[PDB]
């Protein structure tokens, strides 16, 4: 069953059982849900409402315009090179782009800034938990990610609108995430996100006021494969609009990424590289298998 971790259980006598569950999910699922994570319920409710409203007022017209312009207004055959997805990006660090998005409101912008800061603080707390589970010094992962300008932190704001013929196209094709740690505020009613575990696609259950955590390729490298980046996709449906507000805590562009030496006994099979070089390779082969990308950094 899909791991849901109650972070409030870290403050007392259940801490060891809870950390152990975090480690077990990191090893065997690559994903887990957290509850009682510190983010105000009211703020999540406001981000949810304003994202859905902005889709209706702005994104939806652009999505249908995109459909006709690619002939995707009439699905007849399988489409394996396009994602049934409506998306824009919000940059937080190194430098925010929030002031340049022309069609969002003052209240949205201010709320997104509040939300983004809180998520960045949670991302850093979660990485220290990972450090503790791995036997690394506190702040080890935060230090590796810093580079010279600090981490890269952005939010992908997506909707997966109803699709008449879901078996013809995915909402988002299977892939692993290139980056560090991913913090997803997903729709709490409409399913669609799945991960691959032990030969089966397993749904990431919609859960009110929860955050979905997963680990990217960079943590697989740093942990010497102890924590693997796992494949995931988004399927469409004929009815429903799945919301997705996914924030990515990634290394800075010039950060040197390598397996932590205390996790390496035998010579590591993972490469040492500069993060931007990984990103430039990933951009073009995102939906191809993950493992050639590690071998390509050698
Ligand atoms: O858009 C993605 O690739 C994504 C979104 N949420 C969680 C993980 N990955
Ligand atoms: Zn992803």
Author numbering: 6 to 303
From the reporting publication:
ACC is then oxidized by the ACC oxidase (ACCO or ACO, referred to as ACO in this study), giving rise to ethylene, carbon dioxide (CO2) and cyanide3. ACO enzyme is a 2OG-oxygenase ‘related' enzyme that belongs to the cupin superfamily, which uses a non-heme ferrous iron (Fe2+) as a cofactor and facilitates the integration of molecular oxygen into a myriad of biomolecules. ACO uses ascorbate, rather than 2-oxoglutarate as the co-substrate, and requires CO2, one of the products of the ACO reaction, as an activator. Overall, the structure of AtACO2 resembles the Petunia hybrid ACO (PhACO), featuring a double-stranded-helix jellyroll fold surrounded by α-helices.
